[PDB]
Amino acid sequence: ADFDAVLKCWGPVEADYTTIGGLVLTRLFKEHPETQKLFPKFAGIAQADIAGNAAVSAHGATVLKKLGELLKAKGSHAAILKPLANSHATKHKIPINNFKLISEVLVKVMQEKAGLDAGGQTALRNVMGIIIADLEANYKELGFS
Numbered sequence: 001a002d003f004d005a006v007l008k009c010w011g012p013v014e015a016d017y018t019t020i021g022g023l024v025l026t027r028l029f030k031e032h033p034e035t036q037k038l039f040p041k042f043a044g045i046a047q048a049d050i051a052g053n054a055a056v057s058a059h060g061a062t063v064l065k066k067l068g069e070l071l072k073a074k075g076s077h078a079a080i081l082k083p084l085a086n087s088h089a090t091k092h093k094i095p096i097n098n099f100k101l102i103s104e105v106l107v108k109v110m111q112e113k114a115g116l117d118a119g120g121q122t123a124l125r126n127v128m129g130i131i132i133a134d135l136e137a138n139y140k141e142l143g144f145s
């Protein structure tokens with residue numbers, strides 16, 4: 001049910017993955033500046049320059065498309081989630097806590113831009129908690145605690 005609650009507000013997100021994607025990453029980098037340094041292509045870009053950066057927004061669209069494709073799965077997502085754990089642990093080298101940070105940003109962006117109400121905020125936290133716990137379990141299988 002929590003997946004359905006999120007999907008009932010996904011329309012504004014999917015309508016403009018570039019704009020919403022850029023909002024998410026801009027906010028992430030502003031509020032959690034250590035996360036910017038985990039993107040070598042973006043690390044060192046002055047904060048004031050991020051909101052207008054088309055490459056940042058394009059990457060944010062990639063992220064949100066993948067999250068959309070994890071929703072329109074409603075829990076049965078191992079063929080999507082295992083590769084994401086693999087690349088984020090072994091290629092991008094992203095500590096697990098950073099997924100919690102981007103999830104908090106997404107909740108706020110959806111509250112502001114997508115009509116996600118109090119119950120929907122809780123639903124999204126629940127869904128992101130499922131996703132993050134699966135990433136973490138996969139990280140452990142790879143040797144990353």
Ligand code: HEM
Binds near residue numbers: 035062066067094
């Ligand atoms: C649930 C949230 C996230 C999703 C859905 C997601 C999704 C993606 C996807 C689909 C890609 C491209 C394919 C791949 O490399 O695996 C990617 C790349 C990447 N992600 Fe994530 N990601 C998430 C969170 C994060 C976080 C929190 C960080 C760092 C703080 C991060 C850092 C990266 C980096 C550095 C790349 C490579 C960018 C490039 O070289 O072009 N990701 N992510």
